[PDB]
């Protein structure tokens, strides 16, 4: 999946194997294949409660940057999932 | 023609109307229950009465 | 709608076949079939009786529905096509020159 601040699906783009010179020629073999987004979990606190993020490796920082913006935010209310959501 | 007269007497049945109409239908549904019975035994009914009545009930229901 | 046509119940001339020139009043008009009965066409229904109730029911020669296009209305003359002049309120058919 893709899920979080990430915003990245999983693109199906082929991988074609070839045999060759480049200084004599270059020929082929080709098939569809699915490229996945490097993707990790990120646990963080945010007031009370924990809260995980199924984010891509790229935007791991964005998530911390989000908790920083959350300090300026008024939250609580037994909001486990609810925080994440209201957490933009 | 029958309509005209019958219908006026219904906003005319506005003296205790809502209640009155209700009471009225009740008797009307019954007058017709008499018919459906009499028609059932056959020799004791001459049509229209039943539909004219059914239709009265209806508009009256309004 | 629009099924309506020439005259209603009244005096009419037959420009048909076996009764051309004949005259009579129309005693019925069947729009569902676009025809009218006058006093002209008459056929013999040897038939015993139409419906089982009643023993005898007649050899009646009664009038056969006449096609509505073989009959023309008529007044102080020989029957004219129908115009329509509306009064100062309603509307009524004036013939080719007179009322009614």
């Amino acid at each position: 999946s893709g899920k979080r601040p990430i915003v990245a699906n999983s693109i199906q783009r082929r991988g074609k194997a070839k045999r060759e010179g480049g200084v004599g020629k270059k020929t082929t073999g080709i098939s569809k294949r699915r490229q996945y987004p490097n993707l990790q979990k990120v646990r963080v606190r945010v007031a009370g409660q924990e809260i995980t993020f199924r984010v891509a490796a790229s935007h791991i920082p964005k998530v911390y940057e989000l908790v920083e913006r959350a300090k300026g935010l008024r939250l609580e209310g037994l909001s486990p999932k609810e925080i994440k959501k209201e957490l933009l | 023609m029958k309509l005209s007269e019958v219908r006026k007497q219904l906003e005319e049945a506005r003296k205790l109307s809502p209640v009155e109409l209700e009471k009225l239908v009740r008797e009307k549904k019954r007058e017709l229950m008499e018919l459906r019975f009499q028609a059932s035994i056959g020799q004791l009914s001459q049509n229209h009465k039943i539909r004219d009545l059914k239709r009265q009930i209806a508009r009256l229901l309004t | 709608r629009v099924k309506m046509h020439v005259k209603k119940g009244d005096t009419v001339l037959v420009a048909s076949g076996k009764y051309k020139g004949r005259v009579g009043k129309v005693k019925e008009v069947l729009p569902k079939k676009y025809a009218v009965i006058v006093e002209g066409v008459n056929i013999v229904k040897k038939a015993v009786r139409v419906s089982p109730k009643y023993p005898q029911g007649g050899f009646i020669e009664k009038e056969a529905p006449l096609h509505a296009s073989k009959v023309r209305p008529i007044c102080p003359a020989c029957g004219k096509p129908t115009r329509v002049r509306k009064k100062f309120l309603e509307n009524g058919k004036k013939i080719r020159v007179c009322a009614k």
Partner: protein, 92 residues
Amino acid sequence: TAYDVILAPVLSEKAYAGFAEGKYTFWVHPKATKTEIKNAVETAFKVKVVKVNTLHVRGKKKRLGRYLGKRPDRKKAIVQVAPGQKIEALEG
């Protein structure tokens, strides 16, 4: 909507024979309850009902010429009137 439960008296040798006992019987709404039958037949012929039997009548399937069809179903019900009393209306 109360004379709408009882539809019509059922006319049969079998139904007439029930008149001997306090057993009157007539066609009723198919979605009718033995209980609502009671409170209806009661307030329509002014008589205590003691017992109600009901049953459905699968409608016979007729056919006119090449056109094949079906009659409508009905729920027949037989009321038992308190000892003594009677429905003159049916007594014809």
